[PDB]
Amino acid sequence: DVEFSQAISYVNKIKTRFADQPDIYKHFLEILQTYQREQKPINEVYAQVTHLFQNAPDLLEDFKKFLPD
């Protein structure tokens, strides 16, 4: 609920940071869709998001707040 709203705010931050690179935003969306559809483990999603946001270290740190513990 609060966590859902925090997730909405975070994904919006990604969308606006990559407003001129929609393919990167789209890739982030597909990482999550693939995670769910292929039942990938957390560590594989962590690897993919780390690579995607290599030049966006603040977005990477924000992502980690959604991970277990």
């Binding site: 966590e3 859902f4 925090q6 997730a7 909405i8 975070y10 994904v11 919006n12 969308k15 982030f28 969306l29 999550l32 869709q33 995670y35 769910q36 957390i42 999603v45 959604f66 991970l67 277990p68 513990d69």
Partner: peptide
């Protein structure tokens, strides 16, 4: 749109 955004939020918010 906001659909894709809310979908990603739902998946993200359920990993922990």
């Amino acid at each position: 749109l906001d659909d894709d955004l809310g979908t990603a939020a739902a998946v993200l918010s359920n990993m922990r």
